[PDB]
């Protein structure tokens, strides 16, 4: 009797709004341009599935269309906020060691999880053995870098799809976005780009968690009286 | 009961179908969010193929009209001994200052190319700019 | 009257620079490993330059320096490869320190 109203007022209400957490106010094409998100790899490194998201090549250096990035980034942040609102487990994954420390701290600050280390065979596809039969896997995996250190796709991208886990991923011009659920074309190398990504996801996740508590508290006070 | 066939459809299509068939008793936590706010492209595995014959990537080289002026300025006067400051978003180099004056004089009706380039150098020298010809 | 991406790209210093070969740029040292200086100069990738023999101690974290760029990204395609190999760093020559 009271559960249907709970799930309707708390879990189903956010899904009726186009931007329930107002993540569009977090970034702009200018803010992305200042972080050098449009800078891609050289044309010789281009992945063919990233061609839709490329504005052009400026002297053999690919330029990422930030108008598309802005639309993809809006969707990725929107999905991430909703999953944080629903109390999903969000796992950040990246093998770029220049940013391992930054990413691990961002996860701890937002109350989420980070995996920046060597990814051992079967963390996801054999989790019950490695962790235990009652282990809960992540509900969302966010890749700040989708390639490993030999310039191949991170194994967790394939394994996340196997386990039916949605993936958000920054995909540079040499990356493969086919299996990434919510790809965001953008520069994954420059510290200014990577720092921006961490602020946006950190803020989206923190905002969604605060929104969940506000709604719950209001729903209880009104329930008693 | 589920499906690890990551190359068969997408996590959404595989999940939606197994929910209908009753194989999955409950929907995953992410399913309702994906449904309301789906990605622009459904994430379906694809095998990247190599181009052959007369197939070429659609990416186009980015050029501007002023690039012709920049190529000539670098050839005639070389790169300025002044250093580029790519951190300042409003930085103007000697070449950019040359290009802006070159554009101003073109809008005043001058149409010759060799004449429109010599008058621009004089204007900057009058303004105190150092233009050392390479040769 | 919201600026478009095409406008940002057209008027960006990196776009206005043209080719990067033999271009003097100002870089900033952000990381140092022994005598290896990691210098950002506004591009996608940093460059790594060895500490100069003269006035080596003047090069510290945050020190702004003058560079002569050679390549924004060191990449090459090797025989039997479908793509290009990249070392994920720019090629530049450290000239000295920038002072006011």
């Amino acid at each position: 009797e009271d559960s249907t109203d709970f799930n309707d007022k708390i879990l189903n209400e956010p899904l009726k709004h186009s931007d329930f957490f107002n993540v569009k106010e977090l970034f702009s094409v200018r803010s992305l341009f200042d972080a050098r998100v449009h800078l891609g790899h050289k044309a010789g490194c281009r992945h063919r599935f990233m061609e839709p998201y490329i504005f052009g090549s400026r002297l053999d250096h690919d330029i990422i269309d930030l108008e598309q990035t802005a639309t993809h980034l809006q969707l990725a942040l929107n999905f991430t906020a909703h999953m944080a609102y629903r109390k999903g487990i969000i796992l950040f994954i990246s093998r770029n060691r220049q940013f391992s420390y930054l990413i691990e701290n961002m996860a701890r600050d937002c109350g989420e999880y980070a995996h920046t280390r060597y990814f051992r065979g079967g963390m996801l596809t054999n989790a019950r053995l490695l962790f235990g039969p009652t282990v809960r896997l992540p509900d969302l995996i966010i890749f700040l870098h989708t390639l490993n250190n030999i310039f191949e796709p991170h194994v967790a991208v394939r394994d996340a799809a196997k386990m039916n886990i949605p993936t958000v991923g920054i995909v540079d011009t040499n990356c493969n976005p086919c299996l990434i659920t919510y790809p965001v074309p953008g520069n994954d190398d420059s510290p200014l780009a990577v720092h921006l990504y961490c602020r946006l996801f950190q803020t989206a996740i923190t905002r969604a968690k605060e929104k969940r508590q506000q709604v719950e508290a209001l729903y209880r006070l009104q329930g008693q009286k | 009961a589920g499906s690890r066939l990551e190359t068969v459809g997408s996590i959404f299509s595989r999940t939606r179908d197994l929910v209908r068939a009753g194989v999955l008793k409950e929907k995953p936590l992410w399913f309702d969010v994906y449904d309301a706010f789906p990605p622009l492209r459904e994430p379906v595995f694809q095998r990247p193929r190599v181009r052959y014959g007369k197939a070429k990537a659609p990416i186009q080289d980015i050029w501007y009209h002023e690039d012709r002026i920049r190529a000539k300025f670098y050839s005639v006067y070389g790169s300025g001994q002044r250093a580029f400051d790519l951190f300042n978003p409003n930085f103007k180099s000697t070449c950019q200052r040359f290009v802006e004056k070159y554009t101003e004089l073109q809008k005043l009706g001058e149409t010759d190319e060799e004449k429109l380039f010599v008058e621009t150098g004089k204007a900057l020298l009058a303004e105190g700019v150092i233009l050392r010809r390479v040769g | 009257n919201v600026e478009s991406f095409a406008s940002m790209l057209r008027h960006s210093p990196l776009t206005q620079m043209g080719p990067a070969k033999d271009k003097l740029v100002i870089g900033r040292i952000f990381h140092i490993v022994e005598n290896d200086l990691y210098i950002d100069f506004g591009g996608k990738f940093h460059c790594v330059c060895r500490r100069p023999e003269v006035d080596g101690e003047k090069y510290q974290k945050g020190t702004r320096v003058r560079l002569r760029l050679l390549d924004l990204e060191l990449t090459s395609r090797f025989l039997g490869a479908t793509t290009d190999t990249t070392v994920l760093e720019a090629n530049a020559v450290l000239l000295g320190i920038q002072e006011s």
Binding site: - | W63, Y64, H65, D67, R68, Y74 | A6, L9, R10
Partner: peptide, 26 residues
């Protein structure tokens, strides 16, 4: 449409091809 969009043309910064020491000599 938009004035700042890229325009199609040939590389203005392209360098000439290399030449041997005897290129152009009998």
């Amino acid at each position: 449409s938009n004035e700042d969009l890229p325009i199609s043309m040939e590389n203005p910064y392209k360098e000439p091809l290399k030449k041997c020491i005897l290129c152009g000599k009998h």
